[PDB]
Ligand binder design. Structure first.
Ligand code: SF4
Length: 83
């Protein structure tokens, strides 16, 4: 039920960043990004997510201009939301 402009698996940057719309199907544990234990990381608590863009579970991400990610997803660029 992904929106027409959702980040897809064929997206070059999505591939490079290991993005997945479902964090439970991601390599967050292996990346071990700092800020929060790996298993707690997803788009919803990432500094780059844009809550003012998109609707419902599909919001914006500063790193994917013009597209939408899933709040329950994850990518290697995950950064703790401090703002
Ligand atoms: S940068 Fe953050 S909000 Fe954007 S896809 Fe990656 S984890 Fe999700």
């Amino acid at each position: 039920a992904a929106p027409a402009n959702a980040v897809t698996a064929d997206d070059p940057t999505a591939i490079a960043l290991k993005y997945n719309q479902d964090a439970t199907k991601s390599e967050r544990v292996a990346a071990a990004r700092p800020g929060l234990p790996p298993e707690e990381q997803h788009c919803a608590n990432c500094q780059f997510m844009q809550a003012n863009v998109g609707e419902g579970d599909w919001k914006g991400c500063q790193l994917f201009p013009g597209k939408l990610i899933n709040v329950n997803g994850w990518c290697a660029s995950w950064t703790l939301k401090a703002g």
